[PDB]
Enzyme design. Structure first.
Site, mmCIF file in Angstrom:
data_model
loop_
_atom_site.group_PDB
_atom_site.id
_atom_site.type_symbol
_atom_site.label_atom_id
_atom_site.label_comp_id
_atom_site.label_asym_id
_atom_site.label_seq_id
_atom_site.Cartn_x
_atom_site.Cartn_y
_atom_site.Cartn_z
ATOM 1 N N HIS A 234 0.815 -1.134 -0.003
ATOM 2 C CA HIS A 234 0.143 0.126 0.057
ATOM 3 C C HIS A 234 0.805 1.120 -0.005
ATOM 4 C CE1 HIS A 234 -3.544 -2.675 1.959
ATOM 5 N NE2 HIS A 234 -2.892 -2.852 0.686
ATOM 6 N N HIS B 202 -8.939 -1.908 -5.403
ATOM 7 C CA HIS B 202 -8.119 -2.215 -4.378
ATOM 8 C C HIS B 202 -7.044 -2.944 -4.815
ATOM 9 C CE1 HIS B 202 -5.812 -2.116 -0.578
ATOM 10 N NE2 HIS B 202 -5.918 -3.601 -0.810
ATOM 11 N N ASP C 159 -2.942 -2.785 -5.374
ATOM 12 C CA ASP C 159 -1.898 -3.781 -4.693
ATOM 13 C C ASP C 159 -0.879 -3.936 -5.980
ATOM 14 O OD1 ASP C 159 -2.817 -4.154 -2.188
ATOM 15 O OD2 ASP C 159 -4.161 -5.833 -2.884
ATOM 16 N N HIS D 127 -0.467 -11.092 -4.726
ATOM 17 C CA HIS D 127 0.912 -10.431 -4.629
ATOM 18 C C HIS D 127 1.909 -11.488 -5.304
ATOM 19 C CE1 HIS D 127 -0.098 -6.950 -3.083
ATOM 20 N NE2 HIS D 127 -0.891 -7.657 -1.885
HETATM 21 C C1 LIG Z 1 -2.439 -5.873 3.989
HETATM 22 S S1 LIG Z 1 -4.337 -6.480 4.010
HETATM 23 C C2 LIG Z 1 -4.446 -7.521 2.607
HETATM 24 C C3 LIG Z 1 -5.541 -8.331 2.420
HETATM 25 N N1 LIG Z 1 -5.801 -9.044 3.748
HETATM 26 N N2 LIG Z 1 -5.114 -9.899 4.311
HETATM 27 N N3 LIG Z 1 -5.459 -10.371 5.447
HETATM 28 C C4 LIG Z 1 -6.630 -9.431 5.656
HETATM 29 C C5 LIG Z 1 -7.379 -9.336 6.725
HETATM 30 C C6 LIG Z 1 -8.353 -8.446 6.755
HETATM 31 C C7 LIG Z 1 -9.521 -8.236 7.935
HETATM 32 C C8 LIG Z 1 -10.056 -8.091 8.707
HETATM 33 C C9 LIG Z 1 -10.940 -7.874 10.094
HETATM 34 C C10 LIG Z 1 -10.797 -8.686 11.146
HETATM 35 C C11 LIG Z 1 -11.707 -8.419 12.152
HETATM 36 C C12 LIG Z 1 -12.610 -7.306 12.114
HETATM 37 C C13 LIG Z 1 -13.600 -7.077 13.457
HETATM 38 N N4 LIG Z 1 -14.709 -7.987 13.332
HETATM 39 C C14 LIG Z 1 -15.583 -8.111 12.383
HETATM 40 C C15 LIG Z 1 -17.144 -8.259 12.618
HETATM 41 O O1 LIG Z 1 -17.159 -9.000 13.565
HETATM 42 C C16 LIG Z 1 -16.417 -8.594 14.891
HETATM 43 C C17 LIG Z 1 -15.540 -7.717 14.539
HETATM 44 C C18 LIG Z 1 -12.573 -6.569 10.946
HETATM 45 C C19 LIG Z 1 -11.936 -6.708 9.852
HETATM 46 C C20 LIG Z 1 -8.544 -7.818 5.623
HETATM 47 C C21 LIG Z 1 -7.608 -7.808 4.544
HETATM 48 C C22 LIG Z 1 -6.811 -8.803 4.424
HETATM 49 N N5 LIG Z 1 -4.027 -6.814 1.218
HETATM 50 O O2 LIG Z 1 -4.930 -5.770 0.738
HETATM 51 C C23 LIG Z 1 -2.830 -6.810 0.731
HETATM 52 O O3 LIG Z 1 -2.556 -6.505 -0.244
HETATM 53 ZN ZN LIG Z 2 -4.048 -4.624 -0.526
#
Ligand SMILES: CS[C@@H](Cn1nnc2cc(C#Cc3ccc(CN4CCOCC4)cc3)ccc21)N(O)CO
Ligand SMILES: [Zn+2]
EC number: 3.5.1.108
Length: 299
Positions: free
Chosen positions: A78, A237, A241, A264
């Site tokens: 990002h 998005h 990336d 990626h």
């Molecule tokens: C660098 S990000 C990556 C893509 N990527 N990889 N792992 C990820 C994980 C998430 C997440 C999440 C999350 C967890 C908890 C909550 C809370 N809860 C929700 C509702 O219920 C209770 C509360 C909210 C949201 C999103 C994107 C992800 N990426 O873009 C790489 O480029």
């Molecule tokens: Zn991303």
């Protein structure tokens, strides 16, 4: 000429690593001509320095990780997208932990931090990599391709395994002018489906995830109170990336990237295939900005 750019001023941010949940202190420092983007871990002794280059990518699961020895810098995609978008050539990125902070899950906050600090034009020609021939990688139905194009264009298609807003696929083509990145891409947040996120959380992954830094899709509808920033924020998005991964070439691209379900890992395989295929690219500078195929925003 089109000049190299750095920051006018040191600027500092704080945030959480989405994967690690760790509090991180981020410093962006101005750097001289022909530095490139160089990451370092301030919390280690000695401090370790990792150029933001394809050859230093060690892991590509959910994010791009830079590795040198057993030192890692996770989630560079990002921030590198922000620095690509604004045409930053030269900068030190100094981190107190193994992960770039997620901020709001987009490049928006980084773009604003950089653009606040101000850009400084430097007395050296900005180097570009011109795609002179087609270069492709495939893994099953996944595809990533560089094709020649006099400018910079990204075409991207995602293909979900179930309908989201009545369709499995989402496609966007952005032909970048100087303003395209800031307007149409930089604010696109990362996203996940509720069942994927709950699984990741259970494995002690995504420890810094929240509705404040990620779009959460509960099967086929967005949970986030204020909704989406763009109609096809998800594919925008994935374009963000790809722009961050592309900048690991260490110079700005003249050409088009086309991805079909390309994350990626496949983006990194395309980078390595292009670098190995030296007849498919050439480094070029523009002593006349007016005849160049790319233009950046005024500094
Ligand atoms: C660098 S990000 C990556 C893509 N990527 N990889 N792992 C990820 C994980 C998430 C997440 C999440 C999350 C967890 C908890 C909550 C809370 N809860 C929700 C509702 O219920 C209770 C509360 C909210 C949201 C999103 C994107 C992800 N990426 O873009 C790489 O480029
Ligand atoms: Zn991303």
């Amino acid at each position: 000429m089109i000049k190299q750019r750095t920051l006018k001023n040191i600027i500092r941010a704080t945030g959480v690593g989405l994967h690690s949940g760790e509090k991180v202190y981020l410093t962006l420092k101005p750097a001289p001509v022909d530095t490139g983007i160089v990451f370092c871990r301030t919390d280690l002794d000695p401090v370790v320095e990792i150029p933001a280059r394809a050859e230093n990518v060690g892991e590509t699961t959910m994010s791009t990780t830079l590795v040198k020895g057993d030192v890692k810098v996770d989630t560079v995609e990002h921030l590198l997208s922000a620095m690509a978008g604004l045409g930053i050539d030269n900068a030190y990125v100094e981190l107190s932990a193994s992960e770039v902070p997620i901020m709001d899950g987009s490049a928006g906050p980084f773009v604003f931090l950089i653009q606040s600090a101000g850009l400084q034009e430097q007395e050296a020609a900005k180097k570009f990599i011109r795609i002179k021939r087609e270069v492709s990688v495939e893994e099953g139905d996944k595809r990533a391709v560089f094709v020649p194009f006099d400018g910079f264009k990204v075409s991207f298609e995602i293909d979900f395994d179930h309908p989201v807003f009545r369709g499995r696929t989402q496609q966007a083509s952005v032909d970048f002018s100087s303003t395209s990145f800031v307007k149409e891409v930089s604010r696109a947040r990362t996203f996940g489906f509720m069942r994927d996120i709950e699984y990741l959380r259970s494995q002690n992954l995504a420890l810094g995830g929240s509705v404040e830094n990620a779009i959460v899709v509960d099967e086929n509808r967005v949970l986030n109170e204020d909704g989406l920033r763009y109609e096809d924020e998800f594919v925008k998005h994935k374009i963000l990336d790809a722009i961050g991964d592309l900048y690991l070439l260490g110079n700005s691209l003249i050409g088009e990237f086309r991805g079909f379900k390309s994350g990626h890992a496949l983006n990194n395989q395309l980078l390595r295939t292009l670098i190995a295929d030296k007849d498919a690219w050439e480094v070029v500078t523009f002593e006349d900005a007016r005849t160049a195929p790319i233009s950046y925003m005024r500094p």
